[PDB]
Description:
Chain A: This is Fusion glycoprotein F0. The structure holds 3 protein chains of 3 kinds. By secondary structure, chain A is α+β, with helices and mostly antiparallel strands.
Amino acid sequence: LKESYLEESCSTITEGYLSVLRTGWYTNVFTLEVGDVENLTCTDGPSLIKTELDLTKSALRELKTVSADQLARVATAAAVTAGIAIAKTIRLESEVNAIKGALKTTNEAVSTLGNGVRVLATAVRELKEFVSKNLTSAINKNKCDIADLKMAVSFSQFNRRFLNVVRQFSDNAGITPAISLDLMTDAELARAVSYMPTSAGQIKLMLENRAMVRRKGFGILIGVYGSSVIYMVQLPIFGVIDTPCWIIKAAPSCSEKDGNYACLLREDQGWYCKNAGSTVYYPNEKDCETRGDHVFCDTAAGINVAEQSRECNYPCKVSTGRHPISMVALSPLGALVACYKGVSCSIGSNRVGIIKQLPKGCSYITNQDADTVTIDNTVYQLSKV
Amino acid sequence: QGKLVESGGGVIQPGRSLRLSCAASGFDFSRYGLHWVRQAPGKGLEWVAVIVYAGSNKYYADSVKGRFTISKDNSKNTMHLQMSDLRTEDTAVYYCARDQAFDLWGQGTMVTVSSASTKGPSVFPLAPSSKSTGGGTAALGCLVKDYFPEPVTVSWNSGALTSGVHTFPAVLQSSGLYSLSSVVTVPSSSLGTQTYICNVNHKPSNTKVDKKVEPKSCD
Amino acid sequence: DIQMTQSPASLSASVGDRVTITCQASQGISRSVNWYQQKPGKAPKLLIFDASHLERGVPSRFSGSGYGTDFTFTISSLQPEDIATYYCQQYDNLRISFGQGTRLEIKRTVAAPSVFIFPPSDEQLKSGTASVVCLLNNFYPREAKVQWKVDNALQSGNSQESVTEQDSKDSTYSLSSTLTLSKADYEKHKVYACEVTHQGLSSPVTKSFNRGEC
Lengths: 385, 219, 214
Ligand SMILES: *[C@@H]1O[C@H](CO)[C@@H](O[C@@H]2O[C@H](CO)[C@@H](O[C@@H]3O[C@H](CO[C@H]4O[C@H](CO)[C@@H](O)[C@H](O)[C@@H]4O)[C@@H](O)[C@H](O[C@H]4O[C@H](CO)[C@@H](O)[C@H](O)[C@@H]4O)[C@@H]3O)[C@H](O)[C@H]2NC(C)=O)[C@H](O)[C@H]1NC(C)=O
Ligand SMILES: *[C@@H]1O[C@H](CO)[C@@H](O)[C@H](O)[C@H]1NC(C)=O
């Protein structure tokens, strides 16, 4: 990474990043199967199995309540409205039955929906299996204080996924803000990334940054159908990788004239990538996220701009107020300190206390020169790479 | 099993707030949700509100949507109902019930939503207009009037007379004061022999009174 | 939401007979129906869960049937201590809901009421208001009209009745009416009767007194 300090504008350009552009959304539908708990009943009073059974039963009822309320009258409102649309499609009667039948023979299928879209469809059957073959028989005619403790404790550990799913959806009106491991385990995430409609290289990159894949998605409850729970998970599709990107950070550049401040400030800070078609600008910090040397940007947040990176002759984006703003702006490889208007600005080390006081007027600190820069008892920790 | 115990019902004025409580013992309170359900004197059972085992999801009957709030504290094993802007309809016994394992209810508390003040009863007698003939059966009794609130209690000759006693449910006067009656039937002959005295007790205003009721011997 | 609607309104039956309460669910709740018994001034007691399971220590007599929307609570041979009110409750989801209830009453031969009238007390009239009281003693069935009459003039809306619970010994009821007036209007009239009509009386019993001589 090459960070260059442009002193005329109080700015940094940090160069040589590599892009990962979200270009679409993959949809994975889940059927978590609880199995027939309706006819299982305990009549021998307090019991670990009775409580975990009652807990399952009441989770089913809670989810039925949550789905009832869900009535048409790190996720963009854009991303979520997209997902709600997909979910309306899947919540039809026909479509649910289609998916249930697609998963009769196998554990995992590519179901097509009535509009044409293809969705992955997983069956999570561990609880129904445990309930149908292990628990129903160990409950001998309504008696749950079974002497087999290993069985009891297994029930307790087998419905953990279901109840956690029911908690996450019920606590968010059926739209979780991100993707817990109860919604989609890491196995299932990797399996679903590998089936995405893109080429093997983007799939490779995604599988190397699974956690970043998961950060950008979310879940929507579909409904409760019998003793099964249908929900969906939207994974991001990084359909385009490895175009070059740079970040521009800046602060105010004022000259002082005995009372009067003659200021300058760039208004083009953010992330840029020269990918194919245009040069693209991502203006908000939430928009692009770095891991190591790759920068992951939501293409929905992109503005197209022209060729640039001069000083300013061309018409660069900059300000000309008479008003100062003292502040710190942390670049990938350091800091830009903008000191004005009666305030005390300094460098700091985590070993040696106060390394070098700073002078009024925008200084630039490489991160190998400090661990800290403060402006009047507000302390900024520099980024270390 | 264990139990549910409710607390904090009483009298409260129409538009103020009151906080009911339910105390759990003897079961795994942390893995069961619970309900409040109430019944107004006379009327049936009406569901009020529910909270899930985690405490993080609640639902209300529309009766009390926007005024009542349900909460659960697993640390002290206890659940609460915070009623606000009480109306007269809220007057009822308030019941604590375990969800999904519905066999376990509390015993109740009375929330009485009235703008009236504690008052002892005036205890007037009731004996016939006239001497009657020597035969038949005859009825006497006392009338306990204008007291607040509902728990009043009456006996006859210090619990010594029971047979043919009838104490009625109280009625609610337009004043907002309860009045009820209590009658006993004896053989109309032996009222010149026995002494019939009325024993009223109204603990809310710490009231305790006796009234001797005098019929007329006959011919 | 979900509506349980419970039938019949009320029920009267002789000790030994076959009781059949029915509940109908606004939607199909599949087997998520409890049946509660409650005796006056007592917390309800769960008898039947999951529409058909007997709770432990509940007697042989009680039984529940149903799946879908139409449910049936049934007692085979009623017994004394089975007299109570019964409620159905659904728990299809977290928003539970109850049935309106049904009231059970031991049935008995018709027995007409003893009628007694009482005038206000001297003690009470020293204070400014007058309570005339009328007592219907030990009758059956519950239904009765008490009609007050001041100077052969039919009253309305100055009266409060209150009726007891059925007797455990003789299965009868008793009613008490209170006619309340101001001393001003109590002295503006002389004849004060109550006229009871009931199924066990061949003509209506009228019981009165005059304001002066007690
Ligand atoms: C163990 O638990 C399972 C569920 O987890 C039960 O499986 C269900 O069993 C019930 C039987 O009680 C089935 O419900 C019945 O539905 C009928 C109508 O629905 C069907 O209608 C058409 C044909 O008309 C079907 O093609 C279609 O698939 C619908 O599903 C009703 O006619 C029945 O009602 C009658 O019986 C009850 C008394 O029990 C009366 O109250 C009613 O008045 C009426 O007489 C009945 O409700 C249900 O479909 C089953 N589901 C599945 C998935 O199998 C098991 O039965 C249960 N084990 C036991 C022993 O109960
Ligand atoms: C369930 O039952 C089968 C056969 O009885 C057994 O092999 C299996 O291990 C059991 N699983 C558990 C978790 O008890």
